[PDB]
A and B are shown apart, each in its own frame.
With several copies, the nearest count.
Chain A
């Protein structure tokens, strides 16, 4: 039944915001690249150094 069943959206290639439910992305746990450097959080060690 599962093999003959429709693939989940997590394994269908594209997942459009029409396809999947709402908060499903926060529920998940994935990986992605980034681009760029975020700023350095000026913390105690930065300051005291």
Chain B
């Protein structure tokens, strides 16, 4: 199995053994320390947990439980320690989504993103971006329906599209600390999946996030449409001949 961030995890590092929940991040392209949701299979990543401190460049190993009844391979993970600090700088992505209300040529209103003009004028000048890849900017809150706003774009966006704002929101791990004192007897935290089967809870699954097989109908466009006065005033050699 691969292993989810926030899940319990028992670490063998230094003399101690201790059960914690880690926070997995990558170092985006050495920029911003982005919190993963799963550990990258066959790839190194950065974890961050809360417990005993060790001088760096120390090896360690790692497990999900000490069950003899594990069918196979009770060890799970390994690596070295990189660094220690207080209050790491973890970030996770946040997508603030609207949907266009009307669409003029460039400037598009966008409605279902905000709950107040206050929130908007905080996000004044906001770097907004439709899915299709048109960039753009949020410029003023729109007044009459509270929570709609004005944005200026790079072409004609479409009512089909979804307006997304990219933002970066910090996370901090939790400060749980189990010293997995085996001999005295001790409480291990359980994993989310067996938790769900125990408390009889289905795993959350989104119709909107499960991948789908898209039909692309082959786009054609309308023919060129040229105005009355233009076909009037132009010179003979290039006038349009229509029957």
Is B6 an interface position by the 8 A CB rule? yes
Is B167 an interface position by the 8 A CB rule? yes
A3 and B137 contact, CB distance less than 8 A: no
How many inter-chain residue pairs (CB < 8 Å) link A and B? 84
Is A40 an interface position by the 8 A CB rule? no
Is A25 an interface position by the 8 A CB rule? yes
Whole-angstrom distance from the CB of A19 to the nearest CB of chain B? Answer: 10
Chain A residues whose C-beta falls within 8 Å of the C-beta of B165 in the assembled complex: 32
B119 and A26 contact, CB distance less than 8 A: yes
Chain B residues whose C-beta falls within 8 Å of the C-beta of A28 in the assembled complex: 169
* Complex interface bits, A13-48 against B, C-beta within 8 A gives 1, otherwise 0: 111111011111110101111111010000000000
B136 and A35 contact, CB distance less than 8 A: yes
Chain A residues whose C-beta falls within 8 Å of the C-beta of B167 in the assembled complex: 30-32
Whole-angstrom distance from the CB of A16 to the nearest CB of chain B? Answer: 6
Chain B residues whose C-beta falls within 8 Å of the C-beta of A6 in the assembled complex: 204
Contact of A15 among B95, B123, B196 (CB under 8 A): B95
Chain A residues whose C-beta falls within 8 Å of the C-beta of B113 in the assembled complex: 16-17
B137 and A36 contact, CB distance less than 8 A: yes
Whole-angstrom distance from the CB of A34 to the nearest CB of chain B? Answer: 5
B127 and A25 contact, CB distance less than 8 A: no
Chain A residues whose C-beta falls within 8 Å of the C-beta of B6 in the assembled complex: 3
Contact of A30 among B97, B169, B199 (CB under 8 A): B169
B201 and A4 contact, CB distance less than 8 A: yes
Chain A residues whose C-beta falls within 8 Å of the C-beta of B231 in the assembled complex: none
A33 and B112 contact, CB distance less than 8 A: no
A23 and B119 contact, CB distance less than 8 A: yes
B196 and A4 contact, CB distance less than 8 A: yes
A30 and B168 contact, CB distance less than 8 A: yes
B118 and A23 contact, CB distance less than 8 A: yes
A15 and B94 contact, CB distance less than 8 A: yes
Report B's interface with A, CB cutoff 8 A: 6-7, 91-98, 112-116, 118-119, 122-123, 125-127, 135-137, 147, 164-169, 171, 192, 195-196, 199, 201, 204
A-B contact pairs, 21 of them (CB 8 A): A3-B7, A4-B195, A4-B196, A4-B199, A10-B94, A13-B95, A15-B96, A15-B97, A16-B112, A16-B113, A17-B98, A22-B115, A22-B116, A23-B116, A25-B115, A26-B119, A32-B126, A32-B127, A32-B166, A32-B167, A34-B127
